[PDB]
Amino acid sequence: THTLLGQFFQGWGTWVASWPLTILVLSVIPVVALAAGLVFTELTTDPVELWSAPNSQARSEKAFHDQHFGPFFRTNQVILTAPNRSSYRYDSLLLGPKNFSGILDLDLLLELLELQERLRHLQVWSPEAQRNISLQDICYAPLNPDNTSLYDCCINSLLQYFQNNRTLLLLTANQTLMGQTSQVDWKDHFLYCANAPLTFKDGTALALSCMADYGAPVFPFLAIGGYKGKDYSEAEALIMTFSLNNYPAGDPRLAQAKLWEEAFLEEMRAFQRRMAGMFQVTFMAERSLEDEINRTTAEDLPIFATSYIVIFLYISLALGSYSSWSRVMVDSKATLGLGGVAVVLGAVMAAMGFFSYLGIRSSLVILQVVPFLVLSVGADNIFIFVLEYQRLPRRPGEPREVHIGRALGRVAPSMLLCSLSEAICFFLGALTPMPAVRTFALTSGLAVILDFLLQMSAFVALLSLDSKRQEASRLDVCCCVKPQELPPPGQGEGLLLGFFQKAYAPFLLHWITRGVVLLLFLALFGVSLYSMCHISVGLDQELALPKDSYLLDYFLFLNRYFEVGAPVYFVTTLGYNFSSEAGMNAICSSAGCNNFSFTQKIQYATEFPEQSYLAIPASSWVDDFIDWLTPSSCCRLYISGPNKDKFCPSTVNSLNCLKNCMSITMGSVRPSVEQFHKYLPWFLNDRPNIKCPKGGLAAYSTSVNLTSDGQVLTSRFMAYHKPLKNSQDYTEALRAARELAANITADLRKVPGTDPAFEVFPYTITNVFYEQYLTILPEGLFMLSLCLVPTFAVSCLLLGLDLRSGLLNLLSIVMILVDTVGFMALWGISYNAVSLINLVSAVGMSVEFVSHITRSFAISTKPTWLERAKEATISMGSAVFAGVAMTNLPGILVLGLAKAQLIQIFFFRLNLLITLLGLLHGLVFLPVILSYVGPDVNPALALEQKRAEEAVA
Amino acid sequence: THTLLGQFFQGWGTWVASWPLTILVLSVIPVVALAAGLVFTELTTDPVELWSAPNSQARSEKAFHDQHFGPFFRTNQVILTAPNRSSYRYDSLLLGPKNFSGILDLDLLLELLELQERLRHLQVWSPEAQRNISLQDICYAPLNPDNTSLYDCCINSLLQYFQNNRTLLLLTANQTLMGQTSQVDWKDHFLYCANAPLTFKDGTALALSCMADYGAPVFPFLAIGGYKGKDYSEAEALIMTFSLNNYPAGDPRLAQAKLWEEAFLEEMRAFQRRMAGMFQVTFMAERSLEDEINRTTAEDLPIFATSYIVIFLYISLALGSYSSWSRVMVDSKATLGLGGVAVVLGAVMAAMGFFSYLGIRSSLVILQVVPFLVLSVGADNIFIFVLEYQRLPRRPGEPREVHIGRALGRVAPSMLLCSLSEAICFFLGALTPMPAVRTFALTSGLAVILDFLLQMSAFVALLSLDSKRQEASRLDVCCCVKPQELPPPGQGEGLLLGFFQKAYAPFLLHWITRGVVLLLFLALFGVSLYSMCHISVGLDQELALPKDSYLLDYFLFLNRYFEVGAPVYFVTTLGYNFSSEAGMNAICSSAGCNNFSFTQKIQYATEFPEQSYLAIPASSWVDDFIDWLTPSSCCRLYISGPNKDKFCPSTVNSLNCLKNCMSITMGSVRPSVEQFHKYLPWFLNDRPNIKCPKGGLAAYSTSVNLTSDGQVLTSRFMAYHKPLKNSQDYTEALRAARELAANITADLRKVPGTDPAFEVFPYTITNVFYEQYLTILPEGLFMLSLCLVPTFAVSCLLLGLDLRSGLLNLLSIVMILVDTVGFMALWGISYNAVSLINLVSAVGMSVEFVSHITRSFAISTKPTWLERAKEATISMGSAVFAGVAMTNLPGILVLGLAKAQLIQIFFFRLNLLITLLGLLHGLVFLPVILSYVGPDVNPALALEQKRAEEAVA
Ligand SMILES: CC(C)CCC[C@@H](C)[C@H]1CC[C@H]2[C@@H]3CC=C4C[C@@H](O)CC[C@]4(C)[C@H]3CC[C@]12C
């Protein structure tokens, strides 16, 4: 079969090289026809679309939540610190001695108040609607979501305990307790606020509204960070969350939100530049991450434009046999290098253009790196072809067309094997769940296919033209010089081949070094197989970002100073009869309701925050509901007046609704179906007041979905993950949350009248990203096995190889892969979709280093195995090294200036590591193993070749 | 250049024919990959989408009308006739002696009443909405478009003059006039109704409501047809229009309408089968035409499946050289014929599949005929190739691969020329305005390209395989017979070539016949150039239909019995101040308003119905408005009561609104801006009553678009085209209407305060179809000139031909085309987009007949011109005839059973005509002209060929 491919591609080559210009044109036309489609590119920036499989579980849960509770509100934080400020003692006289941190000075809080108040009245132009977009238009309003004002927006801060009132900060009174009198200050109100956030009146000779301005109780963990336990006076950070209403992607209000976000960042930069030795401001915006991952691609893209020139120069100076110093300017292959680069750039542009035509949304960070890998893969073929063509002895009375045809015939099977292995590998790598790596893998796959199809026609035509210029003795690139006085005739022996034959092959295949390198590579495999088990799964944040981004400082401050991470929502699906008795029993946590209920289970789970990643219990709505129906003057009905048979709001105190909400109380408040249906929508709109602080609107207004008939479709319960820092923490947190939700559903399905399709799932915002790392190891291992099988299967069909060679090939590929994974885990590179597509590309590429040497040893007729290994090493090892390794490395070493930690880590380092391991194995380990346990001589594979040379000449 | 194409395709052929199976596979893979897309076909049936350029003027006017007045209502008619009924005399005694036609008997009208009344209460199931769709849901209601009932639907008939009341039909009273008494019958009311349709009370001792049931005056021309003048008693047809509300294509109510239409047709078929010797019923539905053009494509598609077998059999029996009668079963080319048919079917399926992928909506009537033309074009190439290959003397010591390569090398330039000429021709034919012919032209173009690309690779590979089986002496199709006793060796001289060389060439190029045929073909060109001017532009209706469709009978009845054709709407664009004084003056027609106004101009135009295609004047709304504001107790205002400062409907007669609608009257009723704005919306809802028959709701409710402020955006005026029969009539009617609208705008733009963008255009329903025939002759002539230039330009580059040959080629093509157009006009084939794409395909194809003979004469070395013409005729005329003509004709002669008058006329007849004229010219006229004024010997074109045979062997 191999000899038939030899004849096939020999015939094709002999034809093409006899019609160069016509085929250059016939090959350029479809490439440009495909590359014209690059103007149809519709780029994605949203982290949700680039890094989540839309048919996954986490995305189905997100879709559900978005349907039944609206989308998760956009968070915009400002983490402050005064490290130059010393701590000071201050006695409370009601709580005792306390140590107040430097950041809790008056002046600093006054400066924060000024910053916040300025950030309220901030507007933009918004030239889309031609009206000044103001905060009340887009801001998140938990109370009064309609007719929202600048004093109704979810602006959490330490100053929401004084409703952003300068006189309430500067307020001081005289409290006489236990006979002694002292000055009660803001600090006393702050300390009374931190220990109990839901108090309408302070308990220290002050009628201060401890509840927030917008009218929901600001919890300490959203106002201060860096404390440990309940010692809130020792707080080392002041947080300020400008929450905005989120909308779907097709809503112009989201565009207006992002305009306000940009203005917020500009204002915050102005504030940071203002306060130098006072604060250490670290801020962000919901747009910031999308802005920081999609900023660099335009900044460091010229460095890749340099990467191409580094390869062009190398191919140009490495193929030009300079051995006269009088005709270097006539023979140095400039045209071939330029052609080669043009071919691979044509191939990548054709691939990207074709995938622009199908309307596949390809991000900037995908188009940034495709061309690099396709070039590094698709220059090796043209290099090996030119080397083989240059090393062929032109037979007497044979034209250049048949000579080029014959060269192509010799090194076509190996080039086809290489291209098919890499194409298959990339197209099987494309099964990753992430759309980004999927699109990337498919792009690189198609690009390698088109690159091979161009290398067969366009490049062979160009080599024919270039060789024709050589025979005419015309200059390297300028073929219009009209040759001068007859240059001395060009006959050499090769410098690279000379160097190898003199030094390397005797040194490597010496009596001593063979044993040494065999033991060394077994030791390397052993160490690697050990060090593999110390691998860290997860592409954690701070890697997508550059090294100079403010978000790095922000994420340092989050992971260091915060006290509760992302808030998790235990969303209850439809098919639960909440209006029933046993329905309310299994969700309640107080006295009267059954033991080991929903809220009680979560409250029990948050005891051990290390085992179960929940730091704070679930804020249940049924508990605050049944407490709202307690006869404590919250719910009342009118007895007379024109407003008969309706609710009496607790805000009024007239003698016309002194009737309590419900009947006699002695045991447990358990309203019947009608009572439940009539009292729930009153609860979900009972704004909290001083009369009784209980009220549904405060924190449950949007946490229950009611249909028109009065049926609770779904209901979510808010719990807080402990500070999540690593990607491991995020994944284990999701896993523990899911397990807890499953354990709760196992108990809740036992209630009579619950549809068994009813399930509770712990939805948080960062679940669509950190779900795969649950089960990326099985999927990845499966993908690498499914890439190792067909590569080997094609390898031992295309080369016409036996099994004694095939097993050595497969062993060498597996050894490279284990060594790569070992050093990947050792260096500190994590394992995820990016590392997976790189390991798949490694399985695809390493064939280049292995297959050439294995074949060059197979088709060999020297008496002893050492001489077969010697000649195989010299010829094909020279080709492999000079072509493959030094077209990978001068490309890779340029990526080391990417500025984006993502590429800087997962492309530069991995491809460097794979290249160096491929080089080492393919040139050092494989010749020695071939010298030891290589195949037999088998002369009817060098004898069977001349049947293929004189037949189709 | 030609010799370089010779070498190029020789090299390619020699390669492919040396690797047959691999290239069969490599060529079948992309064909199947493209042909898999046939499942993505989204077929159009709507005559609007298939037969109108959406960027045209008529479609812009339609879009405008659809925006500002809603879509044109769907018409469903039933034309009745009683030809077996004799006429009878009946005296009126108020109008005088009258002759009543047989169809105006009582019993017949009673049967019509029963039919109509049954057609009112008709419902369907409609399994889409699972509710019984009834008439009131979808029926067109001019009065009361909301809360519509079965007695509020636009059901015009002769029985709307008795509101579908059996007792009002059977009613008879005793009228004493001038002292004499007689029985007044329904006939008297009918005659009083016909002469004045808008009368609430009859004038013959009867209080009969002459106005219709649904409450709009039924005009005589919508109830009776076949009369001539005002002699309505001599009516020979009874019409019944079940008008339905039309909707856009995305409305399920349209689907429900079409369900009701299907049920209507079923009911009408039942009625037609019921009454045999009583009525001659001819009916339709708005869906009927869409149903009749898209029914046949599934019925007569097997006949095309037969057309392929007729060509397969011919190619199979015409290439098998049978000259032994012992080895006919070893040599007859069955595999080649089957392969050829498979290739062309692959090509057409690949083309259709590719155009299914781009989402191009391709109708059934387009996919019905593409494969035929592509096959008839793409079998000639393979036939000529096989003939040339069979006629080549295999040189001693030359393998079959080089022999097939050499054959392909010889007849590649001519095949490429043929394919490029046809591709270019079709792709320039694609510039037709119609989407149907555009899609068709593009499809055939791409199919011919892919067919040529397959003929170069797949077919040459298959010919190599077949020839290999021949050399092995294995049977025709079953190549597994393992040859028997050695068959006698196969050496012949050809039967076709023998017959030609013996009989034809001496007979044609005799001293006598050359002069005869030259004079004959000049006479043919002359007669054709005369008969061309008697051409009929327009694809008239009755051609899209089969010969057995009921719509043929319906269209006969329309063109014979109707008295006014389609109703035209003189739609007035925005930018006219109707509320002004001069505004109302230039649209009014009565006394007071200016002379030569809008309505007066249309009323003057309808005087001569032959010159201007308007049979009835425009029903103006401003005239009936200003007549409605006449103090004649139509409009009144309340003087007291709780309903102060509003209109007082004329229906009431209380003493509370005896105030007239306007001030003192002495001259002309000219309401000011405020009066106009306050009185217009009252007019457009004043339902006509007995008090005064004037009222806007009757016929102007929807003929004025009012904005919320009270500004008339647009306003349409209803006029009736005289009975339009031919396509010429439709086109001249549109042209005359447009001219009249332009003349009116030229006067209306002179009113001060009219935006000069304001224009009036005469919109009717059949304008999107019959607009092109205004200017199809310039567009068609331009397209044929732009197809003649590049064909000739490519012809005298690819063949390497001089100008003395090129001019004879161009002359022969022009002569064929003029002859085709002459016989096209003579036979009775009309000229439109279909005939245009066929004439373009003719310009493309005729190159096959001409170029081969011209070249075969060019490359010739006989001493005298007669001998050059003789040998050119014999060799290449045998190839042209046997291949081209007898692969066109056995294909075409099958289309003559299409059953669809469209294809039966415009494909069968035209392609037959073009084939026979191509045959005649290419084989009779061209050899003789080449014998007379042919080129010189020029030996360096037969001498320059062997440079191309031994070089690339
Ligand atoms: C061309 C391909 C193979 C490499 C570039 C694509 C990768 C590196 C890009 C595309 C989409 C990006 C991810 C999108 C979502 C987020 C947001 C945050 O939650 C963590 C970072 C993370 C997870 C990004 C990391 C980098 C990322 C994965």
Swiss-Prot record, chains A, B:
Highly glycosylated. It is found in: Apical cell membrane; Cell membrane; Cytoplasmic vesicle membrane. Glycans are attached at N84, N99, N132, N147, N165, N174, N294. It comes from the Eukaryota. One of its GO terms (biological process) is cholesterol transport. GO terms for molecular function: cholesterol binding; myosin V binding; protein homodimerization activity; small GTPase binding; vitamin E binding. Residues 300-465 form the SSD domain. Disulfide bonds join C139-C153, C193-C210, C588-C593, C634-C692, C648-C657. Widely expressed. Expressed in liver. Also expressed in small intestine, pancreas, kidney, lung, pancreas, spleen, heart, gall bladder, brain, testis, stomach and muscle. The keyword Zinc does not apply. The chain crosses the membrane at residues 20-40, 301-321, 335-355, 365-385, 411-431, 445-465, 515-535, 781-801, 810-830, 833-853, 878-898, 910-930. Plays a major role in cholesterol homeostasis. Critical for the uptake of cholesterol across the plasma membrane of the intestinal enterocyte. Involved in plant sterol absorption, it transports sitosterol, although at lower rates than cholesterol. Is the direct molecular target of ezetimibe, a drug that inhibits cholesterol absorption and is approved for the treatment of hypercholesterolemia. May have a function in the transport of multiple lipids and their homeostasis, thereby influencing lipid metabolism regulation. May be involved in caveolin trafficking from the plasma membrane. Interacts with RAB11A, MYO5B and RAB11FIP2. Interaction with RAB11A, MYO5B and RAB11FIP2 is required for proper transport to the plasma membrane upon cholesterol depletion. Interacts with NPC2. Interacts with LIMA1. Target of cholesterol lowering drugs. Belongs to the patched family. This is NPC1-like intracellular cholesterol transporter 1. The gene is NPC1L1.
